[model samples]
Target: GKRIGLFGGTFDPVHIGHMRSAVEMAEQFALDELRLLPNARPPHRETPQVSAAQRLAMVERAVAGVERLTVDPRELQRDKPSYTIDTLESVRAELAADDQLFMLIGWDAFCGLPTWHRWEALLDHCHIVVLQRPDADSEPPESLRDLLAARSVADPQALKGPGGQITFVWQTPLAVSATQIRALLGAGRSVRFLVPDAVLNYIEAHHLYR
Candidate 1:
């Protein structure tokens, strides 16, 4: 059905945790492609420490040679605050009517969906796949629980339509954080394995974070 996964984030400095989750979700959903989207102006979070160009470059470097993983620069090109609904809509506009799109997000972020712009319209564009971590809280807010109860599906493969389902997927925790990596780099510490070699080299070359 030409399944695709949309993974969006600040990716201030792309790290292993992000890559691992994307890879796991792509394989789990049998996705044809996984687009890693970097937010240019995060509506809910503080401005990224690095420039948008650097963040995008780091993501491009991290995903290099990783089959089916691509860096999507659409958000970076947008001048307004990045909105998930907007991104989903743009993606839907370009896809075949029958193609299925899944927007991947962490459990923490999924619970805060109500705060996003036009959050309710998200389902109309793509299915939401909540990535679960063992140590993180699994309980959804009451409103979110209601939404889940109404739209949740037990199996992803059973999602026949282009959109309108929610699924929770448990993943092996990588325990890596871009925040931690940024702090490490800021302190002049080594972040060798935390990020891909190509990205690490790019960060070093550009003197990013530090």
Candidate 2:
């Protein structure tokens, strides 16, 4: 099996920010594929504006032609809370023992690892690619080291060699969010460049997030 990059989130309406991250992360980590997973239910968020199917369609439109960025429905189809560990476990069962997985997340999300369900098990399954979040420092949050300490004996940065272990890939800064986009749409403002034209057109056709 190949090294797949997992990026799970509640993409209420997929946008260029996610597309850019997927494309850049795949190239940076030399991953075989970037699975753009839409969360079934965001445990922390109150609610998602669009249905999972609608979100998936938006993601599919956004990732078109971007190599190695494929949409996945494991979390969406789970019919339960979408925990990173559950998704990774399903993926792990499909791969050989030598094959590895890399999970990409923003700095803030990575920093909040302690809040995730079974985060320690998630680390065991994949290497986290920590990207710089808006107004966030480049460091891989304080809990990263603690997550490694509580889970693995090695540090997170040590996982980037020929003999790879869990590591962090500091990506470029991106500040866009679906919440902001939705707010703009609700205010009757245009979201022209914020999301792909196809996605925007799809949203209009379906009257989504209005």
Candidate 3:
């Protein structure tokens, strides 16, 4: 069965850190395709006012020549609320019944799973893989212990069936923040290697973050 990984983020400006992690996840899980789903910024968040279309363009450029990385624009092309479950259901509809689907998220986000919209139904669509750092926040939060204790698998290779299990993997903790990149660009500093050339070109063309 083909394994597919879903990674969702606004990706205000697609950077090396984002691309590297996607590449790593694709390699680590041997995923057929790891999609970079660009989501619209929540109305409540005061993120940079970069247009959704621009972010989509940068993501497209970032993954143009890359293997196993593609952009899924379902959330951006929508007229309604884009919840995680809705996205998972939509993706699941396109795959075969037995194909494996995995959703990649950070440890911090995993800790708050109970509060997500229809969070309990998440595993019905895909397995959740939590990316963690080696030396920090080692244990699951008490609120999540019950769920973790029940569904957590000791090893990712042991995760069988379609969904309803969780695994934690240590990821390369490259400390790069889109916020810091935006700040540097705003202050007239170069963010050359931080972001890909194509994204940097798009930023220059649009005069973004200036």
Candidate 4:
């Protein structure tokens, strides 16, 4: 009886752009919970090397007061690089039979689904939501075009059952980036409005990116 979403990303320092997206998706889907999944695969991240714990903590603080948006540390709990399917299967196995599971991915990642680990059966576990750019101009590959033809729905509301459907949300891109936030923090500048207050407090308290 629950509509749960798994929104996975690096989330080096969870920012307002991420929060806004998660909030909108939760509202649009009438989701009971939308878990911001923090990936744990970066043994050699080429960026500023923010620790997995710090990233996870920031996400925790970012969604602290938000009722529907929450954090799922399942990926971080593992020891190896986790493919999306395995993670989905892990979450799916624990869900109620009728509990709706949604997998959130950006349009770019959706286009690469054909290459994901065992990509074909991804929908066997959760519905796919393509968070798209309002002015997207790119076309899908032939394989994904067929996948869309078979699985795409008129609207998100038209999707029913536990899994196996696709929908798109043409969201306005929030003009903020974690990279920019990191740059500001590195430059001794305040990224006040870019991230949530709680996340800012945590970052400052932890002396991250300083």
Q: What is the C-alpha local distance difference test score of each model?
A: 0.86, 0.72, 0.85, 0.89
- Predictions: Cα RMSD each: 2.0, 3.5, 1.7, 1.3
lDDT of 3 by residue, 1-210 (tens): 789999988787888888888988889889999999988655545245577888899999999998888899988888755789999999999989888998999888888888889888899988899889864687677888888888889799887777888998888756777989999988988888889888888888888887
Worst 10 residues of 3 by lDDT: 40-49
What is the TM-score of candidate 1? 0.93
> Where does model 1 exceed 4 Å of error?
42-49
Clashes of 2: 1
| lDDT over C-alpha atoms for residue 135 of model 1 | 77
- Error (Å) of candidate 2 at residue 136 is 1.5
Higher-ranked by lDDT: 1 or 4: 4
TM-score of each: 0.93, 0.82, 0.93, 0.96
TM-score of 3: 0.93
User: Quick one: how many clashes does candidate 3 have?
Assistant: 0
Better of 2 and 3 by TM-score: 3
Question: Against the true structure, candidate 3 has what lDDT?
Answer: 0.85
lDDT of 1 at 176: 90
- Cα lDDT tens digits for candidate 4, 118-198: 999999999999998855555788888888989999789998999999998878869989899998999999999899999
C-alpha positional error of residue 9 in candidate 3 after TM-score superposition, expressed in Å: 1.2
**Which residue window of length 10 is worst by lDDT in model 2?**
155-164
Best by TM-score: 4
